[PDB]
Write a protein that binds this ligand. Structure first.
Ligand SMILES: CCCCCCCC/C=C\CCCCCCCC(=O)O
Length: 257
């Protein structure tokens, strides 16, 4: 019954709003710097960076550890969103951990696209805007940490998804079932099928003119996988080049290679 799929879409959108303080709709109102009620301060070099906390260790490391704390906060938000996905908390506890362990970064890069345009990325809840060129000029091991996310984002953002689309989509991601180590794949897959059914109807109704958006969105889930592996490879390099630099445990636990 399609009525039950709209109810599910509505439930997930509502819970997405409640779980994620900075939505795509807000991010776009800020980036399209004409709804000029709170425009961001723009960090594009190191002096602007120093004026940054005049409004909002080494600089590459300092930025890296700020991005690190923001991912920790993002994991907390995604985890709270996951508990609202119907059936998720009824799954075996080990599979809950495993679904979050693998789904969390794919979601993070999906949502981080909402905060990006080709030029840069919103930061500090939207108060700031760090330019892509600045991040790309960062010292050696760090300058290329964000570029593949920007590359994904400019293409993903071309789908023109809105938050109500994304709420279903990140739910689909969490409930994969092809994750390594899942103890009971079948109840996961049944939840995902209902989610997939809900996404499909949602894209049909929300984007009637956008041909095969559902297929094209599902195909973006391979871009996400590659971002993750590239990232964990980049982390291993940092763990050995800077043995003085601490990684948050929540993020350490998520990263089991
Ligand atoms: C430092 C985070 C401030 C607390 C709330 C943050 C709200 C979410 C938005 C941006 C987080 C700030 C990111 C800090 C610099 C890293 C750049 C990045 O990769 O996003």
């Amino acid at each position: 019954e399609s009525a039950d799929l709209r109810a599910l879409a509505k439930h997930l959108y509502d819970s997405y709003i409640k779980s994620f303080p900075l939505t795509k709709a807000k991010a776009r109102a800020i980036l399209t710097g004409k709804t000029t009620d709170k425009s961001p301060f723009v960090i594009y070099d190191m002096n602007s960076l120093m004026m940054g906390e005049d409004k909002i260790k080494e600089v590459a490391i300092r930025i890296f550890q700020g991005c690190q704390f923001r991912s920790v906060e993002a994991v907390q938000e995604i985890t709270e969103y996951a508990k609202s996905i119907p059936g998720f908390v009824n799954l075996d506890l080990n599979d809950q951990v495993t679904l979050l362990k693998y789904g969390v970064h794919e979601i993070i890069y999906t949502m981080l696209a909402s905060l990006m345009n080709k030029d840069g990325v919103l930061i500090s809840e939207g108060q700031g805007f760090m330019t892509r060129e600045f991040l790309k000029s960062l010292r050696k091991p760090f300058g290329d940490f964000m570029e593949p996310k920007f590359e994904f984002a400019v293409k993903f953002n071309a789908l023109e998804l809105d938050d109500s689309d994304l709420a279903i989509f990140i739910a689909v991601i969490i409930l994969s079932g092809d994750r390594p180590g899942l103890l009971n794949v079948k109840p996961i897959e049944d939840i995902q099928d209902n989610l997939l059914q809900a996404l499909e109807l949602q894209l049909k109704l929300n984007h009637p003119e956008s041909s095969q958006l559902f297929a094209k969105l599902l195909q973006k889930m391979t871009d996400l996988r590659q971002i993750v592996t590239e990232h964990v490879q980049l982390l291993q390099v940092i763990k050995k080049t800077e043995t003085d630099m601490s990684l948050h445990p929540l993020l350490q636990e998520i990263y089991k290679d």
